[PDB]
């Protein structure tokens, strides 16, 4: 194949230069598991048992014993396949564009296949991270003209039936009000039996900057970050708490546990960008290629994610 597919050979050679997605920092190693699927859905069945009556004392002879029942639930997770196309230079035509310091056509904005694929893969990986964090797909900073998706395709921010708190505009700078809302949400959290788990918080850069000021008489020896960590350790059975900053968020604070029992990510094994075998060819020096990527696979328990939104206007 490598002796007959230059594009495949170049992809194999340059695949190691693409940066790893930043979404991997948002999950524990055990919270990610691959799924062999391109388009369709996954059905996950969770089995439970319950007691029907008090236990039966075993003495002398007896024939009637208490029973134990069973129950099940089914959860459907949809997956979708998407494609992008990009133009590049035909392999045999690179010599007629190789310069001393660069390769390509600066005046016409044409690149070799390797560099074009690297750039496209980087952009698509950024888009995948944005979708994973926010649950929506859009190429605008306004968030409008969103691509229509399938149901059961949710992100960490738009997952339904979670805890949502809103800080009013008049208190957008009052850290005491913000922490009051955070404490209310933390109290409303329902972790169940798996409450003894590490927790993860994601904040926007502005909130991250606010968190490093000393806690307020403006007493020293403690920061708002420390206060938040202690407050979260109150509910997580004094487990580890991690804090991350992402520019994708905007006046949002996202708190969720790093437990595979409550939140899991089962993405497709072809989720990350993968080249397509079809390559458009013509009589000119311009050729086109396609990249495929699969989206979907976040499974979360209800009322296990806290989202705090600081309303600005």
């Amino acid at each position: 194949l490598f002796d007959e597919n230059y594009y495949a050979k170049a992809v194999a050679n340059i695949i190691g230069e693409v940066k790893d997605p930043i979404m991997y920092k948002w999950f524990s190693p055990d919270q990610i598991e691959d799924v062999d699927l391109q388009m369709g859905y996954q059905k996950t069945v969770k089995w439970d048992a319950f007691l029907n009556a008090n236990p039966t004392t075993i003495a002398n002879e007896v024939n009637t014993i208490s029973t134990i029942g069973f129950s099940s639930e089914v959860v459907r997770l949809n997956y979708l396949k998407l494609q992008y196309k990009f133009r590049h230079l035909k392999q045999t035509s690179e010599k007629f564009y190789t310069s001393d310091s660069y390769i390509g056509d600066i005046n016409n904005n044409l690149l070799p296949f390797a560099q074009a694929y690297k750039l496209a893969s980087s952009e698509i990986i950024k888009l995948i991270n944005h979708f994973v964090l926010t649950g929506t797909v859009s190429i605008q900073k306004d968030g409008k003209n969103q691509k229509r998706l399938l149901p059961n395709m949710y992100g960490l921010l738009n997952m339904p039936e979670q805890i949502k708190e809103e800080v009013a505009s008049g208190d957008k700078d009052k850290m005491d009000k913000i922490f009051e809302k955070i404490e209310a949400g933390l109290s409303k959290l329902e972790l169940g039996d798996e409450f003894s788990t590490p927790m993860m918080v994601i904040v926007d850069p502005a909130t991250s900057l606010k968190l490093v000021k000393p806690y307020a008489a403006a007493s020293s020896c403690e920061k708002w970050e420390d206060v938040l960590i202690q407050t979260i350790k109150a509910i997580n059975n004094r487990e580890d708490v991690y804090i991350e900053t992402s520019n994708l968020l905007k006046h949002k604070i996202l708190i969720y546990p790093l437990n595979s029992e409550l939140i899991k990510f089962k993405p497709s094994k072809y989720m990350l960008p993968t080249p397509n075998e079809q390559v458009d060819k013509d009589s000119t020096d311009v050729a086109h290629s396609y990249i495929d990527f699969v989206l979907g696979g976040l499974l979360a328990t209800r009322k296990t994610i806290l989202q705090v939104n600081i309303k600005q206007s």
Binding site: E73, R76, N152, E190, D193, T301, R302
Partner: protein, 166 residues
């Protein structure tokens, strides 16, 4: 039309015992207590290996109700349907929907479990109405072991102990 479709699906699934309904979220088991107060809990809380169990063709939906024998013109065999009073033959403790088969424990055998209650305190004496539902008072020994539990606006269950005719 799709909204009406979904509404009728919801109604028939509420009538059914174990409807197949998918969800987008996992539910969390917070506690191990009061988990058996569901319509899907078939059988009895206390069961003996020497219990006598029969199965019959199902007419209507007799699940968790008192059943009575019913006969047609004679082309088909006898079946069981919801009923009570002097026609009570047994208690339907299970239904298989694929085969349309009702599992019946005869009245001659004592039963202890959850049964449908008419729209009540422990120790009260109960009677089966014409629709197979339990009601407060009597030719059948029925005693309530717990207060009514509501599953739907029209669905109430109660832990009852039936130990033969009176």
């Amino acid at each position: 039309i799709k909204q009406e479709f979904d509404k009728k699906v919801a109604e028939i699934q509420a009538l059914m015992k174990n409807p197949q309904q998918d969800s987008g979220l996992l539910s969390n088991s917070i506690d191990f207590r009061d988990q058996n107060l569901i319509f899907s809990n078939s059988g009895g809380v206390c069961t003996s290996s020497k219990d006598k169990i029969e199965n019959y063709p199902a007419k209507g939906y007799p699940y968790k109700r008192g059943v009575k024998l019913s006969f047609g013109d004679g082309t088909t065999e006898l079946e069981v349907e919801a009923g009570g009073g002097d026609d009570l033959y047994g208690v339907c403790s299970d239904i298989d929907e694929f085969s349309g088969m009702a599992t019946v424990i005869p009245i001659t055998n004592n039963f202890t479990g959850y049964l449908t209650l008419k729209k009540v305190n422990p120790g009260d004496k109960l009677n089966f109405n014409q629709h197979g539902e339990l009601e407060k008072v009597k030719s059948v020994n029925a005693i309530a072991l717990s207060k009514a539990h509501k599953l739907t606006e029209d669905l109430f269950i109660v832990l009852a102990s039936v130990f033969g005719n009176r």
